[PDB]
Amino acid sequence: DVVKQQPGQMDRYLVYGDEYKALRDAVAKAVLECKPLGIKTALKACKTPQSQQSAYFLLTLFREVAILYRSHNASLHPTPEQCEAVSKFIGECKILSPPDISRFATSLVDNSVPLLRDGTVTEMAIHAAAVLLCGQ
């Protein structure tokens, strides 16, 4: 049955747990609707400290948007409007206030990340980048 039944991939960041899953789902739904409002509600509902919220946000941005950019099918690529909405929200988000975090987020949403345009190496690198930036 396997070959007839069959394109989803894994999300190892789930190691963080239910809070990451909730924030990721909220971010995804908000981007698809192009309505950067549920992200704030999810971030308020989250209970981890600010640095963990910032890391979680960066990981969700990468997993959804940056990975979507890697599909050769341009139709899957985020539309300019989704980038504009998430950029405005990043600009207004206080948890992302450090210039470096805001720049890294926007670079993820617009595919301007240097050299982090294999899959496993890129995923691990982006996790490390988030930890290094937010890690106090």
PDB file of N, CA and C in Angstrom, residues 23 27 39-40 42-44 46 48-58 60-61 89-102 105 133-134 136:
ATOM      1  N   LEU A  23       2.577  27.969  18.839  1.00  0.00           N
ATOM      2  CA  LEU A  23       3.010  29.223  18.239  1.00  0.00           C
ATOM      3  C   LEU A  23       3.215  29.040  16.744  1.00  0.00           C
ATOM      4  N   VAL A  27       1.281  31.098  13.828  1.00  0.00           N
ATOM      5  CA  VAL A  27       2.023  31.881  12.848  1.00  0.00           C
ATOM      6  C   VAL A  27       1.645  31.444  11.442  1.00  0.00           C
ATOM      7  N   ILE A  39      -0.831  35.834  15.909  1.00  0.00           N
ATOM      8  CA  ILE A  39       0.520  35.676  16.437  1.00  0.00           C
ATOM      9  C   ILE A  39       0.636  36.338  17.802  1.00  0.00           C
ATOM     10  N   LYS A  40       0.095  37.551  17.943  1.00  0.00           N
ATOM     11  CA  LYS A  40       0.164  38.228  19.233  1.00  0.00           C
ATOM     12  C   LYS A  40      -0.590  37.438  20.292  1.00  0.00           C
ATOM     13  N   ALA A  42      -1.100  34.271  20.439  1.00  0.00           N
ATOM     14  CA  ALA A  42      -0.363  33.065  20.791  1.00  0.00           C
ATOM     15  C   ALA A  42       0.837  33.413  21.656  1.00  0.00           C
ATOM     16  N   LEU A  43       1.497  34.532  21.352  1.00  0.00           N
ATOM     17  CA  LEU A  43       2.658  34.935  22.131  1.00  0.00           C
ATOM     18  C   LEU A  43       2.249  35.346  23.536  1.00  0.00           C
ATOM     19  N   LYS A  44       1.057  35.928  23.681  1.00  0.00           N
ATOM     20  CA  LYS A  44       0.551  36.242  25.010  1.00  0.00           C
ATOM     21  C   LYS A  44       0.156  34.972  25.747  1.00  0.00           C
ATOM     22  N   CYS A  46       1.556  32.050  25.356  1.00  0.00           N
ATOM     23  CA  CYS A  46       2.778  31.355  25.720  1.00  0.00           C
ATOM     24  C   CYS A  46       3.202  31.753  27.129  1.00  0.00           C
ATOM     25  N   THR A  48       6.649  30.787  28.348  1.00  0.00           N
ATOM     26  CA  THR A  48       8.089  30.801  28.505  1.00  0.00           C
ATOM     27  C   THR A  48       8.614  32.236  28.533  1.00  0.00           C
ATOM     28  N   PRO A  49       9.830  32.438  29.036  1.00  0.00           N
ATOM     29  CA  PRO A  49      10.404  33.788  29.082  1.00  0.00           C
ATOM     30  C   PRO A  49      10.592  34.374  27.691  1.00  0.00           C
ATOM     31  N   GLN A  50      10.929  35.667  27.667  1.00  0.00           N
ATOM     32  CA  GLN A  50      11.004  36.397  26.404  1.00  0.00           C
ATOM     33  C   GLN A  50      12.028  35.796  25.451  1.00  0.00           C
ATOM     34  N   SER A  51      13.196  35.390  25.957  1.00  0.00           N
ATOM     35  CA  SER A  51      14.216  34.873  25.052  1.00  0.00           C
ATOM     36  C   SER A  51      13.750  33.589  24.386  1.00  0.00           C
ATOM     37  N   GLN A  52      12.984  32.773  25.108  1.00  0.00           N
ATOM     38  CA  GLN A  52      12.455  31.562  24.508  1.00  0.00           C
ATOM     39  C   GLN A  52      11.350  31.889  23.519  1.00  0.00           C
ATOM     40  N   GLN A  53      10.552  32.925  23.789  1.00  0.00           N
ATOM     41  CA  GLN A  53       9.559  33.335  22.806  1.00  0.00           C
ATOM     42  C   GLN A  53      10.242  33.790  21.527  1.00  0.00           C
ATOM     43  N   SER A  54      11.344  34.530  21.653  1.00  0.00           N
ATOM     44  CA  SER A  54      12.024  35.043  20.470  1.00  0.00           C
ATOM     45  C   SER A  54      12.638  33.904  19.672  1.00  0.00           C
ATOM     46  N   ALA A  55      13.247  32.942  20.366  1.00  0.00           N
ATOM     47  CA  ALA A  55      13.797  31.781  19.681  1.00  0.00           C
ATOM     48  C   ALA A  55      12.691  31.008  18.980  1.00  0.00           C
ATOM     49  N   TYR A  56      11.573  30.796  19.676  1.00  0.00           N
ATOM     50  CA  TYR A  56      10.469  30.039  19.107  1.00  0.00           C
ATOM     51  C   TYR A  56       9.920  30.739  17.875  1.00  0.00           C
ATOM     52  N   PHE A  57       9.798  32.064  17.936  1.00  0.00           N
ATOM     53  CA  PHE A  57       9.311  32.815  16.789  1.00  0.00           C
ATOM     54  C   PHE A  57      10.255  32.654  15.611  1.00  0.00           C
ATOM     55  N   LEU A  58      11.562  32.739  15.865  1.00  0.00           N
ATOM     56  CA  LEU A  58      12.523  32.621  14.777  1.00  0.00           C
ATOM     57  C   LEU A  58      12.464  31.234  14.153  1.00  0.00           C
ATOM     58  N   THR A  60       9.843  29.226  14.082  1.00  0.00           N
ATOM     59  CA  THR A  60       8.619  29.067  13.307  1.00  0.00           C
ATOM     60  C   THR A  60       8.738  29.799  11.982  1.00  0.00           C
ATOM     61  N   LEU A  61       9.317  31.001  12.012  1.00  0.00           N
ATOM     62  CA  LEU A  61       9.512  31.746  10.780  1.00  0.00           C
ATOM     63  C   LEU A  61      10.331  30.925   9.807  1.00  0.00           C
ATOM     64  N   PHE A  89       4.552  43.071  11.512  1.00  0.00           N
ATOM     65  CA  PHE A  89       4.378  42.510  12.846  1.00  0.00           C
ATOM     66  C   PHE A  89       5.716  42.391  13.555  1.00  0.00           C
ATOM     67  N   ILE A  90       6.759  41.987  12.831  1.00  0.00           N
ATOM     68  CA  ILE A  90       8.078  41.894  13.444  1.00  0.00           C
ATOM     69  C   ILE A  90       8.522  43.270  13.909  1.00  0.00           C
ATOM     70  N   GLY A  91       8.284  44.287  13.083  1.00  0.00           N
ATOM     71  CA  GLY A  91       8.662  45.635  13.464  1.00  0.00           C
ATOM     72  C   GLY A  91       7.996  46.067  14.753  1.00  0.00           C
ATOM     73  N   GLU A  92       6.725  45.706  14.928  1.00  0.00           N
ATOM     74  CA  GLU A  92       5.993  46.128  16.115  1.00  0.00           C
ATOM     75  C   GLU A  92       6.180  45.193  17.303  1.00  0.00           C
ATOM     76  N   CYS A  93       6.686  43.983  17.087  1.00  0.00           N
ATOM     77  CA  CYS A  93       6.846  43.024  18.174  1.00  0.00           C
ATOM     78  C   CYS A  93       7.982  43.459  19.093  1.00  0.00           C
ATOM     79  N   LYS A  94       7.672  43.625  20.381  1.00  0.00           N
ATOM     80  CA  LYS A  94       8.684  44.064  21.337  1.00  0.00           C
ATOM     81  C   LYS A  94       9.695  42.964  21.630  1.00  0.00           C
ATOM     82  N   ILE A  95       9.254  41.704  21.655  1.00  0.00           N
ATOM     83  CA  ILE A  95      10.163  40.617  21.995  1.00  0.00           C
ATOM     84  C   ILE A  95      11.290  40.507  20.981  1.00  0.00           C
ATOM     85  N   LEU A  96      11.079  41.006  19.767  1.00  0.00           N
ATOM     86  CA  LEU A  96      12.085  40.990  18.719  1.00  0.00           C
ATOM     87  C   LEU A  96      12.878  42.290  18.660  1.00  0.00           C
ATOM     88  N   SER A  97      12.798  43.120  19.698  1.00  0.00           N
ATOM     89  CA  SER A  97      13.337  44.473  19.605  1.00  0.00           C
ATOM     90  C   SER A  97      14.827  44.525  19.288  1.00  0.00           C
ATOM     91  N   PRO A  98      15.680  43.640  19.799  1.00  0.00           N
ATOM     92  CA  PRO A  98      17.106  43.729  19.472  1.00  0.00           C
ATOM     93  C   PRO A  98      17.320  43.785  17.971  1.00  0.00           C
ATOM     94  N   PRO A  99      18.048  44.795  17.474  1.00  0.00           N
ATOM     95  CA  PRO A  99      18.243  44.925  16.026  1.00  0.00           C
ATOM     96  C   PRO A  99      18.608  43.624  15.333  1.00  0.00           C
ATOM     97  N   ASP A 100      19.464  42.822  15.968  1.00  0.00           N
ATOM     98  CA  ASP A 100      19.937  41.603  15.324  1.00  0.00           C
ATOM     99  C   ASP A 100      18.805  40.601  15.146  1.00  0.00           C
ATOM    100  N   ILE A 101      17.957  40.446  16.160  1.00  0.00           N
ATOM    101  CA  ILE A 101      16.852  39.501  16.051  1.00  0.00           C
ATOM    102  C   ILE A 101      15.863  39.961  14.989  1.00  0.00           C
ATOM    103  N   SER A 102      15.555  41.260  14.959  1.00  0.00           N
ATOM    104  CA  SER A 102      14.591  41.764  13.990  1.00  0.00           C
ATOM    105  C   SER A 102      15.126  41.596  12.578  1.00  0.00           C
ATOM    106  N   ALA A 105      14.991  37.900  11.587  1.00  0.00           N
ATOM    107  CA  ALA A 105      13.624  37.524  11.251  1.00  0.00           C
ATOM    108  C   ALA A 105      13.261  38.008   9.854  1.00  0.00           C
ATOM    109  N   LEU A 133      21.688  34.204  19.381  1.00  0.00           N
ATOM    110  CA  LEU A 133      21.165  35.562  19.434  1.00  0.00           C
ATOM    111  C   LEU A 133      20.393  35.792  20.724  1.00  0.00           C
ATOM    112  N   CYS A 134      19.429  34.919  21.019  1.00  0.00           N
ATOM    113  CA  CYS A 134      18.577  35.128  22.181  1.00  0.00           C
ATOM    114  C   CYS A 134      19.260  34.728  23.480  1.00  0.00           C
ATOM    115  N   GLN A 136      21.163  34.662  26.600  1.00  0.00           N
ATOM    116  CA  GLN A 136      21.784  35.694  27.429  1.00  0.00           C
ATOM    117  C   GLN A 136      22.746  35.065  28.433  1.00  0.00           C
TER     118      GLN A 136
END
